[PDB]
Design an enzyme around this catalytic site. Structure first.
Site, short mmCIF file in Angstrom:
data_model
loop_
_atom_site.label_atom_id
_atom_site.label_comp_id
_atom_site.label_asym_id
_atom_site.label_seq_id
_atom_site.Cartn_x
_atom_site.Cartn_y
_atom_site.Cartn_z
N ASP A 181 -12.84 9.58 5.74
CA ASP A 181 -14.05 9.89 5.47
C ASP A 181 -14.54 11.51 5.91
OD1 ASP A 181 -14.53 8.33 3.38
OD2 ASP A 181 -16.37 7.12 4.55
N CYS A 215 -9.75 14.55 -7.23
CA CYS A 215 -10.31 14.22 -6.13
C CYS A 215 -11.67 13.98 -6.70
CB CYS A 215 -10.08 15.01 -4.73
SG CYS A 215 -10.49 16.82 -4.87
N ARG A 221 -8.83 17.95 -1.63
CA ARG A 221 -7.70 17.43 -1.18
C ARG A 221 -6.54 17.69 -2.34
NH1 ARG A 221 -11.09 11.65 -0.76
NH2 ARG A 221 -12.34 12.41 0.98
N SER A 222 -7.10 17.89 -3.55
CA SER A 222 -6.34 18.24 -4.71
C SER A 222 -5.34 19.29 -4.52
CB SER A 222 -7.22 18.32 -6.09
OG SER A 222 -7.55 17.12 -6.36
N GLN A 262 -10.49 23.61 0.69
CA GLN A 262 -11.81 23.90 1.12
C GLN A 262 -12.22 24.31 2.17
OE1 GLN A 262 -13.41 25.36 -1.48
NE2 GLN A 262 -15.24 23.94 -1.78
#
Ligand SMILES: CCc1oc2cc(S(=O)(=O)N(C)C)ccc2c1C(=O)c1cc(Br)c(O)c(Br)c1
EC number: 3.1.3.48
Length: 292
Positions: A181, A215, A221-222, A262
């Protein structure tokens, strides 16, 4: 190992944030006019995350060909990916029309439907064999054929049917279920394993349309998946593996979709994955065999 050494230099100097900011500053900016059209308001998860007009995927439907998705074309590595946001209640039909029209073999999902008590994307695939899904707006059928829940991820076989023509195809759903998370994984071991499981399936191969990676926003994440995969691929293609520069590969990917990676932690993690990935490739997660 070239980059490894730089990696360690950045750590010592504690300058991940500064490296990451340089990339944000140097990144491409292209228009996203179609994404911003008032009529696509409910086709976008986040206002600040849009596909550039030049690399956006178009739905082969008349009037409103819009979906929040980009084709990232890696000429040197010979790999293409379609990075997209996690489907919305109103875009699941578009999501699958795209998978169909683009001839993708696999869908790579890097999030959970709920994380941190919030909904990160729609439940866009069937959870039970006997309960298939129908997307009326795009005229498609989707059936769960089989599911293989593993430690760090779950692989699903799905059958996608184009109701108009009664044509069917098998789609593989590769679902990484263990991204934490907060922050990023402590070791890349599992993500690298998952990446190579995706490769094994043929979902990233030239004989199929581009893989669909997502994602929640489709850039974080992608970005890590595509960046890691491309870098590794370039390292065994070039005469000088050390010549592969991640920051530059990342800047090239960002010509096609904004925001890839990010945070500074995502950047650091990407380095790690490549470094450890190369080290694995050069010597238990796999058979000692060399049958091939
Ligand atoms: C190159 C892919 C890879 O890289 C790894 C790195 C680690 S590690 O970081 O834990 N390590 C230092 C060995 C573990 C596992 C892997 C790992 C794999 O699990 C893996 C999986 C499959 Br399928 C493969 O064909 C290969 Br090659 C490797």
């Amino acid at each position: 190992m070239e980059m490894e050494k730089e990696f360690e230099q950045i750590d010592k100097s504690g300058s991940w944030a500064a490296i990451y900011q340089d990339i944000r500053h140097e990144a491409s900016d292209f228009p996203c006019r179609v994404a911003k059209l008032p009529k696509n308001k409910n086709r976008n998860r986040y206002r600040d995350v849009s596909p550039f007009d030049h690399s956006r995927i178009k739905l082969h439907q008349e009037d409103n060909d819009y979906i929040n998705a980009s084709l990232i074309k890696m000429e040197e590595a010979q790999r293409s990916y379609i990075l997209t946001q996690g489907p919305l209640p109103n875009t699941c039909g578009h999501f699958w029309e795209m998978v169909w029209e683009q001839k993708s073999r696999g869908v790579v999902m890097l999030n959970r439907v709920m994380e941190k008590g919030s909904l990160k994307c729609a439940q866009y695939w069937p959870q039970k064999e006997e309960k298939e899904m129908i997307f009326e707006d795009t005229n498609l059928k989707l059936t769960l054929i089989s599911e293989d829940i593993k430690s760090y991820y779950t692989v699903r076989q799905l059958e996608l049917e184009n109701l108009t023509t009664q044509e069917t195809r098998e789609i593989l759903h590769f679902h990484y279920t263990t991204w934490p998370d907060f922050g990023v994984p402590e070791s890349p071991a599992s993500f690298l394993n998952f990446l190579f499981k995706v490769r094994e399936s043929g979902s990233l191969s030239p004989e199929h349309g581009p893989v669909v990676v997502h994602c929640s926003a489709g850039i974080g994440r992608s970005g890590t998946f595509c960046l890691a995969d491309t870098c590794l691929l370039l390292m065994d293609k070039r005469k000088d593996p050390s010549s592969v520069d991640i920051k530059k590969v990342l800047l090239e990917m960002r010509k096609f979709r904004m925001g890839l990676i990010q945070t500074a932690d995502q950047l650091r993690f990407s380095y790690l994955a490549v470094i450890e990935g190369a080290k694995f490739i050069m010597g238990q997660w796999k058979e000692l065999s060399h049958e091939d």
